[PDB]
Design a protein around this nucleic acid. Structure first.
Lengths: 125, 305, 148, 192
RNA sequence: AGCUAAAUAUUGGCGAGAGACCGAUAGCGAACAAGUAGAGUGAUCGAAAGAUGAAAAGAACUUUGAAAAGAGAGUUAAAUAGUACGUGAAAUUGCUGAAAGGGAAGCAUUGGAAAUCAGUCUUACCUGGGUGAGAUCAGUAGUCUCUCGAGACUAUGCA
RNA sequence: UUUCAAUGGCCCGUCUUGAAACACGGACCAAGGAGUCUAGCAUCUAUGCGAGUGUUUGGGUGAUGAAAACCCAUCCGCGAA
RNA sequence: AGAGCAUAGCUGUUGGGACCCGAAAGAUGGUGAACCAUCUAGUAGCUGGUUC
RNA sequence: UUGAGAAGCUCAGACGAGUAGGCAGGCGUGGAGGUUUGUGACGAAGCCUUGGGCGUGAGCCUGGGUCGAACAGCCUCUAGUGCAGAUCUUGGUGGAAGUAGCUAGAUCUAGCGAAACCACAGCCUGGGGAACGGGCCAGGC
RNA sequence: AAAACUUUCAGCAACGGAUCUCUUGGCUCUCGCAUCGAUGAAGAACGCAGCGAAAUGCGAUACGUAAUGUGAAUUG
């Protein structure tokens, strides 16, 4: 149960906040779990996704697939993973969007900003 | 789906649909003009842009047979359970058609139509608490070769299990689109002549077993004079059973100019294979040769028969 | 799509369809009723004759306001007209069905109009009545000698 | 107690009551009759005996007024013999000087629970067809894909294509018996 | 002649949290281009309009046509989801089939005919005998939970 | 269920009128569409307490929603007189 | 040798828009005798309707 | 003898039109508390049906088809709770009608095309008292 | 008397958008707060978006510049 009068349990206001969120909020809304190896080595459970991240698809028809994240589609809350495509009528390959919570991060595109993020969120390297 | 206004996005769709029709029309008129002037660009486009069909884009499986003869495949069929039919022995098939317990009148009408398709095949009403394995062991000592059991419930036949006596494989099907002769437009009255059998599109290895089992129910010396043909056709794992009364005549379609005029005889139904068991049919304790999975049949391009 | 008639299976049928056609619904209902069940080749001659006023389309149901004509004695009545716009639409559809049958490899010498139905399209104080027209052409079914 | 409990449960609200048109039923597992009555209520009857089945063995369950406030020890249980005559006497001995209506209702439940176990054993021996569910999604999928398969089959085109093909190969004798003379003459000239 | 916080008010303004409220002819006129389109010289007046699918994968390609479209195909779990898009009632219309029909229909009561359904069955009881089987049976041994004996098991024998 | 046969069967609502006659309303279908909320008074019944009775203007309090529940200082109303 | 007081429900009744739809308005303030907005849910013994 | 939902069970006799009005018990709808250790992608709700059943009835249960994500029984609470009418409101749709007619060609043909109105109907003869003829009764058609 | 025509029933196709389900909307109640303008407000007009259906944003620095923060997007 929530006891703060500063947070709303209203489904109307929760749905409006999620679907009307700005880009700097959808960066956090699009978070993915880390693999057990990374999770117990970086001391971090989940991180927001990013391009060049290496992920494994965990749920859906494409379950078990792996690949880098070519681009994150924050408008529709979708990830676009390389070689995870669908053939069209004319044979052109249309990429398939995957929710960020349906993948797991097996390798992190480490940067100084993310390295600072790890030590910030109780992590280590 | 950006637009939240229904009327606006209906107007936006129509203006994009009209533009798509217009610009595709311009490129089609231009292509037609530039390919009628030069027939070369026309004859290579047709040979290259062949329309795609489910049969053409069927998924790849190595179980499919090849045109060339292979000794291993023909060595396996010369001593199996169906060998007594295709060998020099030429044992005539003696069929036993029976139904499920407490069948109705409608099941008898389908059975009576089904007995027409099979000369030398007798019906025995299913009585009391005799089981399929018991019927099979009792029918084997009576000289029967194949046992056909029609499953009906709620006054409708919905399944068909055929076993090959005495220990041959048992195939379980599910019947659908049952249609007796009276319900078929421009039908005919079947005669007593032995029908011919034509079997098509059973390419896979599992298709050979089912095609041989279906072939093994028919007397191998068809009566040509009656010119009746029974067709089993496997398309997209659906086996279509039909019986016609053909007659060769002149048609303007074929290059040779001869075509047959089919008149349907009935019954008309479709079979979907659900299970193949090695040995007599025991749903609890049978050796599963094949069991269809509905999950992977959702792939419309993948077939097993 | 699916048509109103249980035929139009691939067996012997060729389909032609026209939706939201800009023609009066009551006139098209009469033209369809006349050419229903008649051979495809004969239908082309009949539609050709109507365009040249050699033949008249008898109006049976919506016969109100149709004058007496001498060309309707073939059909047993005397109320007939010479519709052109409605006949033109049916000519376009019949050619489409004929072309569809030819592409299918059907026998073109036995084609008859097995089913033709006109339905009222949405109305658009001058709300006229557009027409939905569907045509099925199939070979005449024939019998074969049984055994003798 | 008992008359206060019955007024609260029998007439205001019991979570065990199934209200039918002709009768009310009891969802309680400890009800002998399965009906909602004053005499068959296990909650409102401080002294109550019932028979119920556990993994093939029938037991006599009894509770007394003196254990009413110890729910874990409220009901006592004894084993009833497979011998019916001994099972009846077991109920008589354990329910001695209980009202004759309560012994009557316990012996009636023992007969029905014995018949049900007998019928359960006879159903195991018999071979009965297994009921397999009808899946609405798969029926719709197979009905639609069948329609596409039948159209794509082109049965009449393929039947006559094979029938003419085997006419050319001469699978019949010298001249076939299903062909008119004029057609056979056309076949011979064309194929040669 | 003058000043003065607090307790009080608050359909506006900046936010916030809620509800036994309404659920697209409702609830604000307005869930969407809404004080918009539109109307009137002007003051003013003022709507109708929500939902393909998980994903556009929004139907390539061949073919008919002047075109719109159609037909072969194709995608989808589903096209009985094709942007005229969830479900798709009634009034109404077309086709097909069956039946009826001397200037009404018309409903009720009782049957016939035709069509079509529920709608069911012997399968069990009693009495054996044989064979082995095992416990709630042992001229039997243990453990556990309750309270001697009551349940649950274990080992052995099946007299 | 359809249909046939025998027998019977005046169009519904409103108003009028002994009654009808009437005059009205009704092309068809869908959705919406009319004794509600509140203050006072009186009867009756139920419930609590009873020569008493009524906590909620307010104060105290309430950590798990705290607009609830729980508690009652001083009055006051109506009864007894 | 006091029977009241409080709450709830039922019913009747009187006020409020007061079961719903119904009768020319009038007044205030505006726009170019007219038009528009509000008071207004104005006034009804009467009309039509008022749902298992 | 088990027949103590004592609000149950049971025995007997009489009785049965009904406007205004009086009284009692029930059916259904939206939401709320409790409950069914409730139903549901192996298909909720809705709709369709010459499938079957229950109730005197309001209504309820169910098969088949369609469908695609929620929903119900029981006790209690609550109310914007039940329609055939209001020359009702909004929407859709008919007959009138391819008519009245208004754009071409040669009054005819083509093309474009309404609205009023609409309980349902449509032979007379008499009698039918209240009009009764258009429905009723006996006769013709 | 069969056809046509009419009527009834059913099947299929149209027509229509009811019902059901939901919903970034409304409505109601409560709570916190005090902040327009000659230093040019409210409003109106005209411009800028590479295209944007509008709508929104912005003001010739035109769907913004500076600074700070997050840290890799934007998206038809």
């Amino acid at each position: 149960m929530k006891f703060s009068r500063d947070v709303t349990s209203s489904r109307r206001k929760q749905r409006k906040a999620h679907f009307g969120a700005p880009s700097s909020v959808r960066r956090v809304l699009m978070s993915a779990p880390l693999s057990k190896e990374l999770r117990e080595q970086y001391k971090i459970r989940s991180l927001p996704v990013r391009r060049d991240d290496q992920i494994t698809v965990i749920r859906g028809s494409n379950k078990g697939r792996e690949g880098k994240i070519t681009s994150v589609y924050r408008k529709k809350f979708l990830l676009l993973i390389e070689r995870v495509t669908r053939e069209k009528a004319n044979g052109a390959s249309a990429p398939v969007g995957i929710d960020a919570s349906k993948v797991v991060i097996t390798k992190l595109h480490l940067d100084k900003d993310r390295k600072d993020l790890i030590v910030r969120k109780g992590g280590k390297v | 789906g950006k637009i939240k206004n229904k009327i606006v996005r209906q107007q936006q769709y129509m203006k994009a649909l009209h533009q798509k029709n217009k610009d595709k029309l311009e490129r089609r008129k231009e292509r037609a003009k530039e390919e009628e002037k030069d027939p070369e660009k026309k004859r290579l486009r047709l040979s290259e842009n062949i329309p795609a069909t489910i049969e053409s884009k069927r998924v790849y499986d190595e179980t499919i047979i090849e045109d060339k003869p292979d000794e291993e495949l023909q060595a396996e069929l010369k001593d199996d359970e169906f060998s007594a039919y295709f060998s020099e022995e030429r044992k005539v098939p003696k069929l036993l058609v029976t139904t499920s317990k407490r069948a109705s009148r409608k099941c008898y009408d389908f059975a009576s139509e089904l007995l027409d398709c099979f000369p030398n095949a007798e019906f025995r009403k299913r009585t009391g608490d005799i089981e399929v394995h018991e019927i099979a062991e009792a029918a084997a000592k009576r000289g029967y070769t194949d046992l056909l059991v029609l499953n009906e419930d709620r006054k409708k036949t919905n399944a068909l299990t055929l076993v090959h006596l005495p220990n041959g494989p048992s195939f379980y099907f599910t019947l659908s689109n049952l249609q007796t002769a009276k319900e078929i437009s421009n039908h005919g009255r079947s005669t007593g002549h032995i029908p011919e059998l034509i079997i098509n599109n059973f390419s896979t290895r599992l298709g050979m077993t089912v095609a041989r089992a279906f072939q093994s129910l028919f007397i191998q010396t068809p009566q040509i004079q009656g010119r009746q043909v029974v067709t089993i056709h496997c398309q997209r794992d659906f086996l279509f059973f039909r019986r016609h009364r053909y007659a060769f005549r002149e048609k303007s379609n074929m290059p040779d100019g001869i075509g047959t005029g089919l008149q349907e005889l009935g019954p008309r139904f479709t079979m979907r294979l659900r299970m193949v068991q090695k040995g007599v049919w025991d749903r609890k304790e049978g050796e599963v040769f094949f069991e269809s999975n509905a999950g992977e049949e959702s792939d419309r391009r993948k077939f097993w028969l | 799509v699916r048509y109103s008639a249980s035929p139009a299976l691939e067996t012997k049928c060729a389909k032609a369809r026209g939706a939201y056609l800009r023609t009066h619904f009551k006139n098209s209902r009469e033209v369809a009723f006349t050419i229903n069940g008649m051979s495809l080749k004969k239908a082309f001659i009949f539609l050709d004759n109507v365009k040249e006023h050699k033949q008249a389309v008898p109006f049976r149901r919506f016969n109100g306001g149709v004058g007496r004509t001498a060309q309707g004695k073939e059909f047993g009545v005397t109320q007939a007209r010479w519709p052109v716009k409605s006949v033109k639409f049916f000519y376009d559809l019949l050619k489409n069905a004929e072309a569809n049958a030819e592409a299918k490899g059907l026998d073109m010498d036995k084609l008859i109009i097995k089913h033709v139905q006109v339905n009222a399209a949405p109305k658009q104080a001058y709300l006229s009545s557009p027409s939905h027209i569907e045509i099925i052409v199939a070979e005449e079914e024939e019998a074969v000698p049984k055994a003798n | 107690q008992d008359e206060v409990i019955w007024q609260v449960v029998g007439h205001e609200f019991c979570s065990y009551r199934i209200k039918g048109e002709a009768q009310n039923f009891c969802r309680n597992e400890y009800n002998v009759t399965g009906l909602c009555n004053r005499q068959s209520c296990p909650l409102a009857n401080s002294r109550y005996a019932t028979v119920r089945e556990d993994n093939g063995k029938l037991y006599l369950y009894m509770k007394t007024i003196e254990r009413a406030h110890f729910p874990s020890k409220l009901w006592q249980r004894i084993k009833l013999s497979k011998n019916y005559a001994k099972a009846l006497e077991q109920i008589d001995q354990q329910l001695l000087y209980w009202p004759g209506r309560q012994i009557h209702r316990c012996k009636q439940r023992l007969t029905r629970l014995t018949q049900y176990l007998l019928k359960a054993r006879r159903l195991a021996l018999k071979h009965q067809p297994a009921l397999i569910p009808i899946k609405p999604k798969q029926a719709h999928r197979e009905a639609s894909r069948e329609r596409k398969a039948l159209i794509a089959a082109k049965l009449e085109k393929n039947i006559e294509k094979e029938l003419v093909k085997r006419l050319k190969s001469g699978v019949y004798g010298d001249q076939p018996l299903n062909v008119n003379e004029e057609i056979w003459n056309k076949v011979l000239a064309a194929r040669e």
